[PDB]
Design a protein around this ligand. Structure first.
Ligand SMILES: NC(=O)C1=CN([C@@H]2O[C@H](COP(=O)(O)OP(=O)(O)OC[C@H]3O[C@@H](n4cnc5c(N)ncnc54)[C@H](OP(=O)(O)O)[C@@H]3O)[C@@H](O)[C@H]2O)C=CC1
Ligand SMILES: NC(=O)C1=CN([C@@H]2O[C@H](COP(=O)(O)OP(=O)(O)OC[C@H]3O[C@@H](n4cnc5c(N)ncnc54)[C@H](OP(=O)(O)O)[C@@H]3O)[C@@H](O)[C@H]2O)C=CC1
Ligand SMILES: O=CN(O)CCCP(=O)(O)O
Lengths: 379, 379
């Protein structure tokens, strides 16, 4: 009846909007657990008071101490919260490949995994897939939500292509020469979406879209050569499916995460009033343009990593995390992010083996981070 | 397997395109019956020669006099062929009120009815709906085909709005003052070989859209106040569904009637290669803008007629036929088309009774034509 929801990363952008959806719909949903890093205790304490949930995980030990009487604390806290909390839905909105163990714990419980943490699927790969029932993983991001809705337009044998839309980021249309001068402040403001700091930078570099191409292949089982990316600056069309007869089915809404969040939580059932619809009483246009793959090769790199398979997507992601951190610190330039990913991937021969265990995945990421640092040291 | 198809109106635009789809897909379809009026008897006779189908109907006895071996000829030849031919699908691409009895007969056989004939729903209304079983009628029109596909995005209970797109016609954005000066020639009237002069006019006047709104209500059971029209000059998006959560699902394809025809024939199964898909390698935009209902009141009039019910929509359509032909003959100006429809409808409340027979519908149309004629002449 009422779905019991554990919210991991409750204090971030996705987590807060998820709590708002749940608060607006006490008929459909109830929060039963919260996990956070500890960097925003004000927010977390506010959430504790508002939801009445004391079943809480805090990653940072000093922060958990500061609060007092937090039942789960330390780096395995989110995972143990998931293992020990009875739930129908686990919303994983943690950031980074650190969401991997909670993702795997969630799947092992049999709960629906409402997945915002793309990195756990990208890194985990077949390891995560083997742990899931069909339909157990339900994507929270707007692109995959769109695709899931659009796929209802036909049978699986009728699918020709999945078309992912990308905003193009703040630097859409820029030359490679132009990109050399980009600052962390210039890359820090998204034209259409309000997200956390990592998702915002990844949108500017197109790595977000590369990761989403990987997730698409893993979630929906479609070959990489049938996953297209088109640039759509308005971010109103969220993605499309083209069928074998020539028909395309597209999903559209004004950008608002509460829509895909609500659908992921309540899948298959839509949540009335979750978000504003497109308003056709006023003029608008939906524009499409090809991605410039020469200036922005991150999606092509993602495909190459995805095709190689095994632990190579974990390498792609881990290489990004390192180079991105070096960009935000002011150590390397903007175009060095995707350049280092490329350098790491093409040295990553050994990592095409399929992971048997989390340890295999961790091993690949450890290597990639080290190799990424070596690439940074060289510039 | 292979669907047995009867094609009614086989010498028209829809009928000949359907026959192409069928000739291109002998695995999926076989023609088992052909029906035409007799004005293009030669084409019908070529179709018999080409397809090998001898099960043919000709409405015009005079035309039938030319041949000597037509199994069905005279008034109701098409109805009789339907009654006596074993089929899985009847494509009704007949034009005008004479499509109505064949529709009723096709429904009675239990075959799927791929419906192009506008009068069957616009005029026949509750007579047709009471005869049809759920899902029996599959629309051929590109807008209705789009809606049927988009309705796959949720349950019936999840539908908020149906949004039909309209090109806006040749006078899109024109003021009322502009519209005073409209000539027949400008209203897309040419001696075009594949198009009735009324269809281009009905598009220009926005009456075509009004008729599509009525058919939408009847096909999908959505109230008139939840059926919207948006102007979309590119005609790439063929229509859209907005769901209760705020999500909109849209169907997009480059204009080509073989797409909706193939799907109507094969429903629910798509036909591979029916039409070209949208191509995103080249930049494009899809524009939307509201219709000025004050300059173009034809759609609101249609809703008024539809809400009234009974035979009121037959009156709407019949009043248009008279007024539109009167404009084309230079007996009235362009703005007076919808003006006369309004006047006839305001006088027409006796026709809000539900029709018991086809004759009730024909009487409504007779009255509406006579009423419109008086309006045109000043008598
Ligand atoms: N934002 C969006 O709209 C979109 C999000 N995504 C995905 O959603 C995920 C998160 O998005 P977003 O909420 O914006 O990111 P945020 O940075 O805004 O939120 C990150 C959350 O994770 C928590 N966290 C950080 N480190 C740890 C840790 N070591 N242990 C436990 N919890 C931790 C933070 O708590 P705290 O900071 O208080 O310590 C915070 O609540 C990402 O993986 C991203 O790819 C996908 C599509 C779009
Ligand atoms: N054309 C389009 O793309 C669209 C069509 N529509 C609707 O779909 C319907 C069909 O489209 P379309 O094929 O172009 O129309 P057409 O006029 O091009 O073809 C009409 C068909 O009806 C036949 N016919 C006429 N009278 C009789 C009769 N008494 N008995 C049996 N058959 C008869 C004609 O035979 P003959 O030629 O010998 O007279 C012809 O084969 C139309 O009514 C239209 O309103 C809706 C949207 C777009
Ligand atoms: O759900 C929302 N997103 O994933 C936004 C992604 C932004 P991008 O299209 O620029 O990567």
């Amino acid at each position: 009846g009422r779905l019991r929801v554990v919210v991991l990363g409750s204090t971030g952008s996705i987590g807060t909007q998820a709590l708002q959806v749940i608060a607006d719909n006490p008929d459909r949903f109830e929060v039963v657990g919260l996990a956070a890093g500890g960097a925003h205790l004000d927010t977390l304490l506010r959430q504790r008071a508002q939801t009445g949930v004391t079943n809480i995980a805090v990653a940072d030990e000093h922060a958990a101490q500061r609060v007092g009487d937090i039942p789960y604390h330390g780096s395995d806290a989110a995972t143990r919260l998931v293992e020990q909390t009875e739930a129908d839905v686990v919303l994983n909105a943690l950031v980074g490949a650190l969401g991997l163990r909670p993702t795997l714990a969630a799947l092992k419980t049999g709960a629906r995994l409402a997945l915002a943490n793309k990195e756990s699927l990208v890194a985990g790969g077949s390891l995560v897939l083997r742990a899931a029932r069909p339909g157990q993983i339900v994507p929270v991001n707007s692109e995959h939500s769109a695709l899931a809705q659009c796929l209802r337009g036909g049978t699986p044998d009728e699918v020709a292509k999945l078309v992912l839309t990308a905003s193009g980021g703040p630097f859409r249309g820029w030359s490679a020469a132009d990109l050399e001068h980009v600052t962390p402040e210039q890359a820090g403001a998204h034209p259409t979406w309000s997200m956390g700091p990592m998702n915002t930078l990844n949108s500017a570099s197109l790595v977000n879209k590369g990761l989403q191409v990987i997730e698409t292949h893993l979630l929906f089982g479609i070959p990489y050569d049938r996953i297209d990316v088109v640039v759509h600056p308005q971010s109103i069309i969220h993605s499309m499916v083209t069928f074998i007869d020539g028909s395309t089915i597209a999903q559209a809404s004004p950008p608002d995460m509460k829509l895909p969040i609500s659908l992921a939580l309540g899948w298959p059932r839509r949540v009335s009033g979750a978000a504003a619809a497109c308003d056709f009483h006023t003029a608008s246009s939906w524009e499409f343009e090809p991605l410039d793959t020469d200036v922005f090769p991150a999606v092509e790199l993602a495909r190459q990593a995805g095709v190689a398979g095994g632990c190579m997507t974990a390498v792609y992601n881990a290489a990004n995390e390192e180079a991105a951190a070096a960009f935000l610190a002011g150590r390397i330039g903007f175009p060095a992010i995707v350049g280092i990913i490329a350098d790491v991937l093409h040295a990553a021969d050994q990592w095409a083996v399929e992971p048997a265990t989390v340890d295999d995945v961790l091993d690949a990421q450890r290597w990639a981070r080290e190799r990424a640092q070596r690439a940074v040291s060289g510039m």
